Amino acid sequence: LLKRDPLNSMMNIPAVLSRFAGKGLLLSENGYLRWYVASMSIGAVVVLALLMVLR
Amino acid sequence: MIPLQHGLILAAILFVLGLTGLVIRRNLLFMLIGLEIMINASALAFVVAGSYWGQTDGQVMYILAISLAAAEASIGLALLLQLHRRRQNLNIDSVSEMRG
Amino acid sequence: MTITPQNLIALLPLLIVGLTVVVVMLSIAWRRNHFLNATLSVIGLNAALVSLWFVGQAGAMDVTPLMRVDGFAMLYTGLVLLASLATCTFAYPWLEGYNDNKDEFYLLVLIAALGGILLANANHLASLFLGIELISLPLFGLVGYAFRQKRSLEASIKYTILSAAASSFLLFGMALVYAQSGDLSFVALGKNLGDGMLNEPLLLAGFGLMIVGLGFKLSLVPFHLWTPDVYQGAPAPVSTFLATASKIAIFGVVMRLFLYAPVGDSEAIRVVLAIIAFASIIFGNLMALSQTNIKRLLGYSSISHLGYLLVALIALQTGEMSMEAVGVYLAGYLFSSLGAFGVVSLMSSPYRGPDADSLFSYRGLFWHRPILAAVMTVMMLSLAGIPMTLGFIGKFYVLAVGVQAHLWWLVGAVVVGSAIGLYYYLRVAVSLYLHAPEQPSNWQYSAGGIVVLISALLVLVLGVWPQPLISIVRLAMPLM
Amino acid sequence: TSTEVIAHHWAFAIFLIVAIGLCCLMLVGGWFLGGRALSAKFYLVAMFFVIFDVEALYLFAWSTSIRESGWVGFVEAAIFIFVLLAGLVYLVRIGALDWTP
Amino acid sequence: MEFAFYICGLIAILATLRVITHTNPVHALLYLIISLLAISGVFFSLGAYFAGALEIIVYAGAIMVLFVFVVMMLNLGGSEIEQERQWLKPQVWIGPAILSAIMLVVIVYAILGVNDQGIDGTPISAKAVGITLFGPYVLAVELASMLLLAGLVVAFHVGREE
Ligand SMILES: CCCCCCCCCCCCCCCCCC(=O)OC[C@H](COP(=O)(O)OCCN)OC(=O)CCCCCCCCCCCCCCCCC
Ligand SMILES: CCCCCCCCCCCCCCCCCC(=O)OC[C@H](COP(=O)(O)OCCN)OC(=O)CCCCCCCCCCCCCCCCC
Ligand SMILES: CCCCCCCCCCCCCCCCCC(=O)OC[C@H](COP(=O)(O)OCCN)OC(=O)CCCCCCCCCCCCCCCCC
Ligand SMILES: CCCCCCCCCCCCCCCCCC(=O)OC[C@H](COP(=O)(O)OCCN)OC(=O)CCCCCCCCCCCCCCCCC
Ligand SMILES: CCCCCCCCCCCCCCCCCCCC
Ligand SMILES: CCCCCCCCCCCCCCCCCCCC
Ligand SMILES: CCCCCCCCCCCCCCCCCCCC
């Protein structure tokens, strides 16, 4: 049951999560300038809304 | 007798409309037009704020703003002309080669 | 206020760089000579460094309602001038491969350095805005200097459009701040408030829009998506300048703005910057995981390293040595980025025209360029925060500053992002020494090699013995 | 709020209104009456006009307050005009303003 | 000066709303010129006489001339964008309009609740702007000359024909 190290695998799963999160985040780098402008405006909305909420 | 809130709201409306024009338009010329609307709106907001305080600094900030607007309109139109003469196409979605 | 002769002494690097712009432009008007105009540019920048010595012999004072000169300004002026000199040195062989006019490059580098110096001394919203634009527009020219190449034109268009939008955001935020507070100087932003009314909604909205513009300029999440495309598309000396001088100058003026403004110690702005720093560290490291392109990898690296700097900025209004941490980290980051982007520039020089490929192909670099491979692996270890490198000294400063201010989420973010950096930086540094199947002779290429070698030696020596750099940074303190 | 200033405001408004209405009425009468049956040098000169027009605006602001600025303002405007003229000399010498190469 | 401010702000808003949703570039630039003239009238209503004069002289008289020059020399006669009108499709504009409306709502909420004695509208002359410009704002003027030089050099290097 242990011949393929289970504790090593459950310590390896942060690397799996990091690779998955990196592949997911790389979808935002699609190379489209209109999306870059849109993401800047989204970030502006988020920053202003956070500042108004926090006051 | 004119409120500061009304002038700032007018400037905010123009800025938001220019940003919308920059986002929704696929032609690079209309993106430059939206940029010009945004920078003119920010300069108008500076003029409104300076007129509220009775200070000349608002018009000085306007002068620096329109210096920037003129120079970056020149640069953006030069790049637009280069894109037109190299691709015969002003679609901004076509110039998307570099990607993650 | 009027300008006394002592004030003219304090403006010495700015005056010398402006005079160098005029002299280089008139020399181009005389005769288009690459060597003479490059030499005049580097002579002007070295004269600006010696003028920094003369400024240090003078006092620290407010030269205008706009500018304030002190040790802080001197340190950032020195960093910007070193980055500009390295950019010119890396640019000469690459421009020697170029076919069109190749002196407007040095004119634009000088004007961008002038903007960096203005941001180093900027004490006013007008000077901040003007310094950002004086950095930005020559970089519009420099990123698309090889506009016949598809990638450089694409990067130029993206950078121009997004920086114009970010300047609009920054200017609108400045206008809202000026609507709230009747003065545009840094020390008066939030001055007319009290009894727990520091978080005025208009002041916070103006600082939010300014944060949008500055966080575009600093490649901070979520204004970071331009960075790998522009870094990959730009010419490699332009990528060197864009990674070092622009980021250093803009972060210095952000540091001074948050030091001097009475709204700098705001809980809402601190929380927003903590969110931006956390996201910047994690996202930059995670996106750099699976990059085979070295320039995109260094773009995501710049995102994460500016996140670490932002963590050092968040602890500014609570602790004391946040300025010292930012100075030490910026010196280390400057030298590491100069080495890395200089190796990328030297192996991509001379320019191969708009039609030929410009991929780095760093695999097996040791078997034909061993010294550049050693410099590149020293820089990869330094950007990873490995001990015996100055990047670790900066990372240690960031961790100490975060621990002192009880920023535990940011401390854990730095640790996790550092582990992810370990992975991809070590991937590059060990791919340098493998075996690749397949795929100079002038003193300016040798000068670029000497620049990257001296950067590597500085990184190693100041990683082992960091006390001289700490002592230099600690005496470069602004007006309290 | 004096009588003279409001009189001149009304006179200027009537001047603009009657002028534009006269042009409009001229075109309306013309249309109603009667029976029925490139090269990049232009961009360069326009861009040069824009840049030198902004620098001209700086000189417009200076020219109305020369006595109030003193000799210090003269030195600053002289540096401004010198940079402006060096840019013009550079444009002439590199062939940017040469229309027939 | 109040009625003029409100009617000119209304004209500017309507004109730029027509700008961003128009297909003909020359018509869009004409509506942009109208919005700039309206904004100059807004400037004149607030007493910023120099700013309104420069809004017509520079913004509506130099920059938009450059835009009209570029549009006329590129000869946009419907190159695969006019025949599509993708920005009028709901899925393209509805999202960003929602995002911009949210940004406007947050900004306007920030504008309200700020103390306001009202804008006097007293004329701030060009003499005072010139005194401030060549007084406490000297380095702004010199480095703005450098900024315009940078724009000149960049635009010449990129936009020359050869
Ligand atoms: C070796 C360790 C690592 C070094 C890395 C350095 C990176 C940044 C480079 C620029 C840093 C400048 C920092 C200056 C801080 C000065 C702060 C200060 O207050 O200085 C005052 C001091 C005079 O003393 P004081 O009596 O206080 O003066 C007031 C009297 N009214 O006056 C001074 O202290 C004068 C300072 C003059 C500095 C001149 C620098 C010339 C350029 C040297 C470049 C060396 C090569 C580096 C690059 C290698 C290749 C990449
Ligand atoms: C993934 C790895 C990284 C993980 C994230 C980084 C570490 C997170 C640590 C969280 C600490 C939570 C502290 C909560 C209370 C904070 C406020 C407070 O009252 O702190 C107590 C004290 C300051 O209060 P004072 O009155 O001055 O008392 C001085 C004497 N202690 O505070 C102090 O005096 C200093 C408190 C120091 C706290 C511990 C710092 C060292 C952390 C060790 C490693 C991380 C924890 C163990 C490993 C977890 C799994 C990785
Ligand atoms: C017991 C709990 C309490 C104590 C906790 C102590 C925490 C610190 C010590 C443990 C750290 C565990 C790290 C586990 C991953 C180690 C790295 C690794 O395995 O790398 C190899 C792998 C590359 O190999 P391969 O998968 O073949 O290639 C894919 C790409 N072509 O690489 C990859 O696939 C990608 C690697 C990405 C970078 C490494 C992952 C970093 C994740 C965060 C590190 C910090 C974790 C903090 C604690 C989390 C919970 C335990
Ligand atoms: C009428 C309904 C709409 C019809 C179609 C559009 C026509 C144009 C409407 C806008 C322009 C006119 C608005 C009405 C102005 C009437 C004059 C006025 O209000 O004067 C007051 C003030 C005088 O200055 P002041 O000395 O401060 O006054 C206080 C006295 N102590 O004045 C000021 O301070 C400044 C006055 C305004 C600035 C000058 C005029 C600007 C014109 C901008 C035109 C924009 C483009 C219009 C295009 C229309 C077609 C689409
Ligand atoms: C302390 C500095 C650490 C970073 C620099 C590392 C480079 C040192 C100088 C180059 C040495 C390279 C040796 C490569 C040997 C490869 C052998 C492969 C076949 C076994
Ligand atoms: C995807 C990567 C995510 C990395 C997350 C890193 C988190 C590190 C651990 C942070 C723990 C913070 C605990 C703070 C407790 C504060 C208590 C204050 C009491 C007054
Ligand atoms: C009141 C009479 C004064 C007579 C002497 C005037 C000359 C001394 C003062 C000159 C100040 C000039 C300042 C120019 C700054 C230029 C900065 C350029 C930066 C690129």
Tab-separated table of C-alpha atoms in Angstrom, chain C residues 82-358:
chain	number	residue	atom	x	y	z
C	82	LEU	CA	23.192	54.304	-13.653
C	83	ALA	CA	20.277	52.597	-15.406
C	84	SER	CA	20.399	55.117	-18.271
C	85	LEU	CA	24.170	54.726	-18.698
C	86	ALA	CA	23.797	50.940	-18.788
C	87	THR	CA	20.967	51.303	-21.317
C	88	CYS	CA	23.136	53.429	-23.628
C	89	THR	CA	26.041	50.974	-23.307
C	90	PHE	CA	23.790	48.015	-24.150
C	91	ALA	CA	22.150	50.025	-26.923
C	92	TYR	CA	25.285	50.825	-28.926
C	93	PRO	CA	25.971	47.309	-30.367
C	94	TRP	CA	22.264	46.686	-30.925
C	95	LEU	CA	21.958	50.028	-32.713
C	96	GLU	CA	25.126	49.183	-34.631
C	97	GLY	CA	23.105	46.365	-36.131
C	98	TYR	CA	20.249	48.788	-36.907
C	99	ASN	CA	19.735	50.313	-40.356
C	100	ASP	CA	17.724	53.532	-39.912
C	101	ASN	CA	18.594	56.573	-37.804
C	102	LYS	CA	20.236	55.551	-34.533
C	103	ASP	CA	20.808	58.766	-32.543
C	104	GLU	CA	17.196	59.597	-31.740
C	105	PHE	CA	17.520	56.552	-29.476
C	106	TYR	CA	20.055	58.375	-27.315
C	107	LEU	CA	17.985	61.555	-27.402
C	108	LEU	CA	14.956	59.619	-26.122
C	109	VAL	CA	17.017	57.843	-23.451
C	110	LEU	CA	18.241	61.238	-22.236
C	111	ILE	CA	14.706	62.662	-22.066
C	112	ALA	CA	13.480	59.587	-20.171
C	113	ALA	CA	16.398	59.988	-17.745
C	114	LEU	CA	15.366	63.628	-17.312
C	115	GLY	CA	11.889	62.448	-16.357
C	116	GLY	CA	13.391	59.969	-13.915
C	117	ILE	CA	15.411	62.747	-12.264
C	118	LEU	CA	12.309	64.951	-12.025
C	119	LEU	CA	10.401	62.094	-10.383
C	120	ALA	CA	13.354	61.605	-8.030
C	121	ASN	CA	13.004	65.204	-6.832
C	122	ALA	CA	9.216	65.501	-7.267
C	123	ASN	CA	7.445	67.143	-4.309
C	124	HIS	CA	4.260	68.180	-6.104
C	125	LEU	CA	1.437	66.661	-8.112
C	126	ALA	CA	2.396	68.726	-11.171
C	127	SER	CA	5.995	67.506	-11.024
C	128	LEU	CA	4.811	63.925	-10.437
C	129	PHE	CA	2.529	64.038	-13.490
C	130	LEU	CA	5.173	65.705	-15.659
C	131	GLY	CA	7.871	63.250	-14.568
C	132	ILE	CA	5.647	60.273	-15.356
C	133	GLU	CA	4.931	61.667	-18.820
C	134	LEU	CA	8.603	62.487	-19.456
C	135	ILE	CA	9.370	58.872	-18.598
C	136	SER	CA	6.498	57.515	-20.678
C	137	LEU	CA	6.616	59.242	-24.082
C	138	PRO	CA	10.308	58.532	-24.900
C	139	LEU	CA	9.540	54.952	-23.892
C	140	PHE	CA	6.731	55.014	-26.467
C	141	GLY	CA	9.429	55.839	-28.981
C	142	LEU	CA	12.000	53.393	-27.638
C	143	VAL	CA	9.687	50.370	-27.354
C	144	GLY	CA	8.716	50.845	-30.986
C	145	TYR	CA	12.139	51.915	-32.181
C	146	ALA	CA	12.288	48.877	-34.472
C	147	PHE	CA	8.725	49.436	-35.670
C	148	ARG	CA	9.301	47.458	-38.882
C	149	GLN	CA	9.413	44.386	-36.652
C	150	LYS	CA	5.927	43.123	-35.799
C	151	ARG	CA	6.607	42.535	-32.100
C	152	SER	CA	8.089	45.983	-31.468
C	153	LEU	CA	5.186	47.747	-33.197
C	154	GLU	CA	2.700	45.635	-31.219
C	155	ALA	CA	4.447	46.416	-27.930
C	156	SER	CA	4.631	50.113	-28.835
C	157	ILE	CA	0.912	50.316	-29.607
C	158	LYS	CA	-0.042	48.431	-26.433
C	159	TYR	CA	2.255	50.506	-24.214
C	160	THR	CA	1.162	53.812	-25.781
C	161	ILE	CA	-2.583	53.123	-25.522
C	162	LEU	CA	-2.412	51.737	-21.994
C	163	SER	CA	-0.085	54.454	-20.697
C	164	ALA	CA	-2.286	57.181	-22.166
C	165	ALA	CA	-5.271	55.590	-20.408
C	166	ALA	CA	-3.310	55.308	-17.155
C	167	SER	CA	-2.192	58.940	-17.423
C	168	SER	CA	-5.842	59.913	-17.865
C	169	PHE	CA	-6.688	57.937	-14.711
C	170	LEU	CA	-3.812	59.544	-12.792
C	171	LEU	CA	-4.732	63.055	-13.945
C	172	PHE	CA	-8.408	62.592	-13.069
C	173	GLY	CA	-7.389	61.320	-9.636
C	174	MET	CA	-5.108	64.325	-9.156
C	175	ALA	CA	-7.988	66.591	-10.161
C	176	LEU	CA	-10.293	64.985	-7.587
C	177	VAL	CA	-7.588	65.304	-4.913
C	178	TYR	CA	-7.114	68.974	-5.833
C	179	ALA	CA	-10.889	69.415	-5.683
C	180	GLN	CA	-10.823	68.124	-2.108
C	181	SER	CA	-7.593	69.755	-0.892
C	182	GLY	CA	-6.846	73.229	-2.192
C	183	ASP	CA	-3.102	72.619	-2.579
C	184	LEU	CA	-1.259	70.331	-4.986
C	185	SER	CA	1.841	69.828	-2.830
C	186	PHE	CA	2.448	66.416	-1.274
C	187	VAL	CA	2.373	67.624	2.343
C	188	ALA	CA	-1.081	69.205	1.950
C	189	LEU	CA	-3.028	66.200	0.600
C	190	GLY	CA	-5.343	65.568	3.528
C	191	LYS	CA	-3.977	68.403	5.665
C	192	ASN	CA	-7.357	70.137	6.069
C	193	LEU	CA	-8.861	67.207	7.991
C	194	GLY	CA	-9.029	66.093	11.602
C	195	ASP	CA	-10.909	64.249	14.351
C	196	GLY	CA	-10.957	60.980	12.436
C	197	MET	CA	-12.045	62.517	9.121
C	198	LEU	CA	-8.880	61.570	7.220
C	199	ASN	CA	-10.827	59.174	4.965
C	200	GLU	CA	-12.660	61.811	2.956
C	201	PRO	CA	-14.422	59.971	0.087
C	202	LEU	CA	-13.292	62.366	-2.653
C	203	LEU	CA	-9.687	62.253	-1.439
C	204	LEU	CA	-9.813	58.453	-1.329
C	205	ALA	CA	-11.330	58.266	-4.825
C	206	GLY	CA	-8.649	60.588	-6.171
C	207	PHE	CA	-5.918	58.525	-4.558
C	208	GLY	CA	-7.598	55.414	-5.957
C	209	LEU	CA	-7.439	56.699	-9.522
C	210	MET	CA	-3.852	57.817	-8.934
C	211	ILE	CA	-3.183	54.296	-7.609
C	212	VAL	CA	-4.614	52.921	-10.863
C	213	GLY	CA	-2.215	55.029	-12.926
C	214	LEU	CA	0.833	54.373	-10.745
C	215	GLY	CA	0.054	50.655	-10.476
C	216	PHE	CA	-0.073	50.479	-14.230
C	217	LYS	CA	3.340	52.119	-14.223
C	218	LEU	CA	4.638	49.695	-11.572
C	219	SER	CA	3.129	46.530	-13.167
C	220	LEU	CA	1.012	45.836	-10.086
C	221	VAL	CA	-1.964	43.456	-10.218
C	222	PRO	CA	-4.549	44.073	-11.747
C	223	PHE	CA	-2.748	46.592	-13.974
C	224	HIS	CA	-0.018	44.147	-14.950
C	225	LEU	CA	-1.140	42.440	-18.171
C	226	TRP	CA	0.865	44.749	-20.438
C	227	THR	CA	4.213	43.837	-18.881
C	228	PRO	CA	5.268	40.564	-20.607
C	229	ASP	CA	4.070	41.648	-24.054
C	230	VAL	CA	5.864	44.996	-23.865
C	231	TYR	CA	8.984	43.447	-22.303
C	232	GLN	CA	9.143	40.776	-25.013
C	233	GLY	CA	8.332	43.107	-27.900
C	234	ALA	CA	10.630	45.973	-26.961
C	235	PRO	CA	14.284	46.073	-27.998
C	236	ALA	CA	16.450	44.485	-25.344
C	237	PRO	CA	18.225	47.701	-24.167
C	238	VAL	CA	14.763	49.284	-24.087
C	239	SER	CA	13.613	46.326	-21.986
C	240	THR	CA	16.579	46.982	-19.682
C	241	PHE	CA	15.608	50.640	-19.257
C	242	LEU	CA	11.907	49.822	-18.878
C	243	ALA	CA	12.628	47.218	-16.205
C	244	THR	CA	15.083	49.332	-14.199
C	245	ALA	CA	14.811	53.095	-14.533
C	246	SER	CA	11.070	53.590	-15.053
C	247	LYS	CA	10.093	51.285	-12.183
C	248	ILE	CA	12.720	52.712	-9.814
C	249	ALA	CA	11.802	56.352	-10.479
C	250	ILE	CA	8.045	55.783	-10.276
C	251	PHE	CA	8.362	53.758	-7.080
C	252	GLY	CA	10.556	56.464	-5.556
C	253	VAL	CA	8.009	59.178	-6.216
C	254	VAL	CA	5.286	56.865	-4.843
C	255	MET	CA	7.413	56.344	-1.711
C	256	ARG	CA	7.801	60.090	-1.225
C	257	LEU	CA	4.099	60.713	-1.894
C	258	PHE	CA	3.087	58.203	0.763
C	259	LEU	CA	5.728	59.512	3.169
C	260	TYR	CA	4.729	63.177	2.939
C	261	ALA	CA	0.947	63.049	2.504
C	262	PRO	CA	-1.129	63.254	5.715
C	263	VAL	CA	-3.511	60.784	4.031
C	264	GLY	CA	-0.627	58.324	3.630
C	265	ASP	CA	-1.388	56.656	6.970
C	266	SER	CA	-4.945	55.793	5.927
C	267	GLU	CA	-6.320	52.373	6.822
C	268	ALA	CA	-8.308	52.028	3.586
C	269	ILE	CA	-5.358	52.861	1.328
C	270	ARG	CA	-3.105	50.567	3.371
C	271	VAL	CA	-5.566	47.671	3.028
C	272	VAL	CA	-5.974	48.274	-0.724
C	273	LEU	CA	-2.195	48.363	-1.186
C	274	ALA	CA	-1.888	45.183	0.899
C	275	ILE	CA	-4.356	43.450	-1.428
C	276	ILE	CA	-2.448	44.738	-4.466
C	277	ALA	CA	0.909	43.620	-3.025
C	278	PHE	CA	-0.396	40.145	-2.120
C	279	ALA	CA	-1.940	39.662	-5.557
C	280	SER	CA	1.150	41.054	-7.300
C	281	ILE	CA	3.564	38.689	-5.519
C	282	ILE	CA	1.439	35.573	-5.955
C	283	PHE	CA	0.262	36.297	-9.506
C	284	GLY	CA	3.670	37.281	-10.876
C	285	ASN	CA	5.352	34.200	-9.450
C	286	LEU	CA	2.528	31.876	-10.550
C	287	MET	CA	2.446	33.258	-14.090
C	288	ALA	CA	6.221	32.984	-14.449
C	289	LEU	CA	6.079	29.227	-13.718
C	290	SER	CA	5.723	27.900	-17.273
C	291	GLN	CA	7.548	30.532	-19.339
C	292	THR	CA	10.080	29.503	-21.965
C	293	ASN	CA	10.600	33.114	-23.081
C	294	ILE	CA	13.172	34.857	-20.901
C	295	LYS	CA	11.749	38.361	-21.417
C	296	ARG	CA	8.189	37.405	-20.470
C	297	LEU	CA	9.678	35.602	-17.468
C	298	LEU	CA	11.494	38.761	-16.399
C	299	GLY	CA	8.271	40.737	-16.873
C	300	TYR	CA	6.414	38.499	-14.427
C	301	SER	CA	9.503	38.652	-12.209
C	302	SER	CA	9.212	42.450	-12.237
C	303	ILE	CA	5.565	42.116	-11.185
C	304	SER	CA	6.507	39.982	-8.172
C	305	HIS	CA	9.510	42.120	-7.175
C	306	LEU	CA	7.439	45.298	-7.316
C	307	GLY	CA	4.997	43.434	-5.082
C	308	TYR	CA	7.796	42.949	-2.540
C	309	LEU	CA	8.644	46.657	-2.810
C	310	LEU	CA	4.979	47.506	-2.254
C	311	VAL	CA	5.055	45.358	0.899
C	312	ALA	CA	7.970	47.509	2.060
C	313	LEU	CA	5.923	50.631	1.224
C	314	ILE	CA	2.882	49.475	3.234
C	315	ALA	CA	4.946	49.441	6.444
C	316	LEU	CA	6.224	52.993	5.867
C	317	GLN	CA	3.842	54.932	8.113
C	318	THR	CA	4.215	52.446	10.989
C	319	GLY	CA	7.884	51.422	11.062
C	320	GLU	CA	11.020	53.434	10.396
C	321	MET	CA	13.437	51.492	8.173
C	322	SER	CA	10.976	51.044	5.291
C	323	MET	CA	12.858	53.737	3.351
C	324	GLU	CA	16.156	51.963	4.041
C	325	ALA	CA	14.612	48.655	2.941
C	326	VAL	CA	13.310	50.217	-0.272
C	327	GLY	CA	16.728	51.719	-1.006
C	328	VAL	CA	18.650	48.484	-0.419
C	329	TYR	CA	16.113	46.405	-2.356
C	330	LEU	CA	16.107	48.878	-5.243
C	331	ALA	CA	19.904	48.841	-5.493
C	332	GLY	CA	19.922	45.041	-5.554
C	333	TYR	CA	17.017	44.830	-8.001
C	334	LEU	CA	18.672	47.402	-10.274
C	335	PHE	CA	21.939	45.482	-10.450
C	336	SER	CA	20.251	42.086	-10.910
C	337	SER	CA	17.935	43.387	-13.643
C	338	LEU	CA	20.814	45.190	-15.367
C	339	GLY	CA	22.796	41.953	-15.434
C	340	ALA	CA	19.911	39.801	-16.671
C	341	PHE	CA	18.618	42.195	-19.329
C	342	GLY	CA	22.191	42.999	-20.334
C	343	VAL	CA	22.950	39.350	-21.013
C	344	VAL	CA	19.712	39.220	-23.024
C	345	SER	CA	20.781	42.393	-24.847
C	346	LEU	CA	24.335	41.255	-25.586
C	347	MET	CA	23.236	37.930	-27.016
C	348	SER	CA	20.609	39.676	-29.175
C	349	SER	CA	23.059	42.303	-30.448
C	350	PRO	CA	23.778	43.368	-33.189
C	351	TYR	CA	20.223	43.837	-34.456
C	352	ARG	CA	19.295	41.203	-37.032
C	353	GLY	CA	16.716	43.323	-38.847
C	354	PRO	CA	12.925	43.232	-38.640
C	355	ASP	CA	12.644	39.920	-40.503
C	356	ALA	CA	15.024	37.670	-38.567
C	357	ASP	CA	14.052	36.049	-35.282
C	358	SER	CA	15.161	37.459	-31.926
